[PDB]
Amino acid sequence: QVQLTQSGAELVKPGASVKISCKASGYTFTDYYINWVKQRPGQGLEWIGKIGPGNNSTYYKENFEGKATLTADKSFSTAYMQLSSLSEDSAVYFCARWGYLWSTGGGFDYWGHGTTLTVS
Amino acid sequence: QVQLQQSGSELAKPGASVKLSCKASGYTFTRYWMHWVKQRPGQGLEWIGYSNPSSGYTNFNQKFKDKAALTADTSSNTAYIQLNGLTFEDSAVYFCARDPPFVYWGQGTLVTV
Amino acid sequence: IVMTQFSNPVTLGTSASISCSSSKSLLHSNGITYLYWYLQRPGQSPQLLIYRMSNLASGVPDRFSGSGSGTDFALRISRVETEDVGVYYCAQMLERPYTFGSGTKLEI
Amino acid sequence: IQMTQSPASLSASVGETVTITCRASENIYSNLAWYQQKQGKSPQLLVDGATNLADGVPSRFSGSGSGTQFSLKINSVQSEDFGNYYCQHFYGTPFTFGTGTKLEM
Amino acid sequence: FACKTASGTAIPIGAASANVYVNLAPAVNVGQNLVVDLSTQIFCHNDYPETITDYVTLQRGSAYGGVLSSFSGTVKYSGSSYPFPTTSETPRVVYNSRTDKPWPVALYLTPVSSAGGVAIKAGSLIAVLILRQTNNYNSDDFQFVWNIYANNDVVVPTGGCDVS
């Protein structure tokens, strides 16, 4: 019955930094992992980084490393991502979950609403 | 009720072997395992032995490898033990216990060098 | 990891057959296939459909079923309804670089 | 796995409550036993693992605590033991005992 | 955990209670005599080796009851010998590789008489064990119970050499 929400639509002039967050409620936030993914029209979907609040361990791919980092708030559920050294990245940012707490589905479940990060 | 009895104090020269006898009665000696606890005079306690009277397979603790023998006898109702290698640091008493945690205990033995 | 897939013409309310081809198949000892399968509509958020291989999730109907093979992938729909249309995805667990599909949209 | 305990020496008065605690790391579970030592006698058991008063004492002895913290609290003390209190865990093959705490009264 | 039986039987994992059907091959040793050898029939595989590793243990609330009365057993949990009316907690075993790995346990019996033992009817209860697991990530625990079921009509020799 739970749902995910993020933030409002933003338009940013090139050369600046942008902040988009994810908010969760209705379950324990300590155990489930956090993954963030982007989709673009005409290009395939690909996820940026893997973060877990239990150990604060950051895994990133080689191509998107040095662009952004992922952090979650332990007191209340909130996901952080700050874009740095920005061009033409006008797409949609999502926040996703991860399963398999002991013997469950173990897939990309619970997907949130859509936003827009346009650039000029 | 069940009781535990054991031998009195025995002194040994350095670099020798000593045997201590623990005797039991009442309960079945075949069914129940054996424990051993080392007590230095006022410096806490350690955990050492773990023997089965049915066979001879023993589970030691890490700090000693060949320093103990832990021989068990199953016909005269007398659980035995053997200590190999004697120095000044081994002068402490040893206890007898039954595995139901550590309920019934023995008396002790003043082993000196 | 490079992966290749629109869709064939589909008869109204019969079946759909789309395939996922891998540059390197995944069969490891116990003989289970590691795939992932998604569904989305325009505007509304995507939802999960199939995990591992023919394992149902949440409260979706049981009509979604597929066939497993090392070099070929298959999945079939039985009934076509208004919200059944859209674009379907495909994902594999290729170690640390997980990669999703390029998309495949069903049409009439 | 280690066993360290804090209070050591306490007090020399009759009537008030006392607190004895043992501290362990790497999260041992509900398998800790408490029993006392008399200066000239063989030790005897008091409480089982977690909280469970064993047969052999009708006095007020109640234990509590779970996770990594375990402590013992008793309401009244009179004509009791002079020696020490020891705590014993049941987790793996190398059983290890804590240090000593002395109560006078 | 997705353990399977060598006869093709898969076990449930969501629920606490479960049943396994294992045949028996009794034989006599110099000191004791094995009754159930599970180091071949039961073996497990894990999932996702890169992120999550697993550990499994058993507590002291195990019993030998059923048709047979309580005896003094001997258990090898990939190590030394423990009494089967368990009074302690086992050491930890770890799973990591995706390939199948055996889960070695043994079940013995202490001889009381030189003649023989009771017969085992095909389809009964043998022993009850409880297991609890912990992860590399989550700090909580999840425990469940297993009871072994009889599949073969065999006898137990107890002590001596059973000749027929």
Numbering used by the authors:
A (entry chain H): 1 to 86, 88 to 121
B (entry chain A): 1 to 99, 102 to 115
C (entry chain L): 2 to 6, 9 to 111
D (entry chain C): 2 to 106
E (entry chain D): 1 to 164
What's written in the study?
Conformation and ligand-binding properties of FimHLD are under the allosteric control of FimHPD, which itself exhibits only minor structural changes upon ligand binding.
The new map from a 4.2 Å reconstruction enabled building of Fabs 440-2 and 445-3, providing confidence in the Fab assignments and epitope definitions, and allowed mapping of the remaining 440-2 epitope. Surprisingly, Mab 440-2 binds to the tip of FimHLD, which covers the mannose binding site and largely overlaps with the known site 1. Binding of Mab 440-2 (site 4) therefore directly competes with mannose binding, conveying an orthosteric inhibition mechanism for blocking of bacterial adhesion, like that observed for the competitive Mab 475. Note, this Mab was derived from mice immunized with the conformationally locked construct, FimH-DSG V27C L34C. Of note, none of the binding sites identified for these three Fabs overlap with the conformation stabilizing mutations introduced into the FimH-DSG TM vaccine candidate.
